[PDB]
Amino acid sequence: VNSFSGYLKLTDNVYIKNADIVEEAKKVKPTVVVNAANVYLKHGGGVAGALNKATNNAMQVESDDYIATNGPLKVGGSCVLSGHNLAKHCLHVVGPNVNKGEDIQLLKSAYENFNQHEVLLAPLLSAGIFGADPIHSLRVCVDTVRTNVYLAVFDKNLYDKLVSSFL
């Protein structure tokens, strides 16, 4: 038993809700919140900009130190950093950005990072400003992630299309 509420169960291990991941995060304090990161961990907009703003820019300060030490992430890769006031940990995962021409097949690799964590609060990778089809992202998610994932979908209209179209 865990503390997530109001989710619809899609599969054995994947759940979905219409929710603001920031507000969902501040209420659950999950062990892991996933950030929709880029390779530079520049949290300017989308999910990342929202999570970072909610941390009072502390996520960005920590991220800049991480990059200065380690260099950029790989597309499809991830790193674990602090969750600040939102979660114990933030898993920054780099899905491919279609608006940069990155290979959508890397989306499966991106979701594989979720399997290193037993339970996660997460957005749909490569959705939103990353330019992928969210219906496809949900499919790859269901077919790749084996751990328990609670997907927060900000847009109510999108949430309903994803549920109604889910096979």
Ligand X SMILES: CCc1c[nH]c2ncnc(N3CCC[C@H](Cc4nc(C)no4)C3)c12
When asked if residue 21 is in the footprint of ligand X (CB under 6 A), the reply is: yes
Candidate list 46, 120, 138, 159; residue touching ligand X; CB under 6 A: 46
Among 126, 141, 142, 149, binds ligand X (CB under 6 A): 126
- Binding to ligand X (CB under 6 A) within 48-67 occurs at 50
d(CA 57, CA 63): 10
Residue 114 lies near ligand X (rule: CB under 6 A): no
| Candidate list 86, 106, 125, 138; residue touching ligand X; CB under 6 A | 125
Work out whether 154 is an interface residue with ligand X (CB under 6 A).
yes
Confirm or reject binding of residue 141 to ligand X (CB under 6 A). Answer: no
How far is residue 100's CA from residue 85's CA, in Å, rounded to a whole number?
31
Judged by CB under 6 A, which stretch of 46-54, 66-74, 107-115, 159-167 contacts ligand X? 46-54
> What separation in angstroms does the CA of 16 have from each of 30, 34, 72, 89, 93?
15, 14, 30, 20, 19
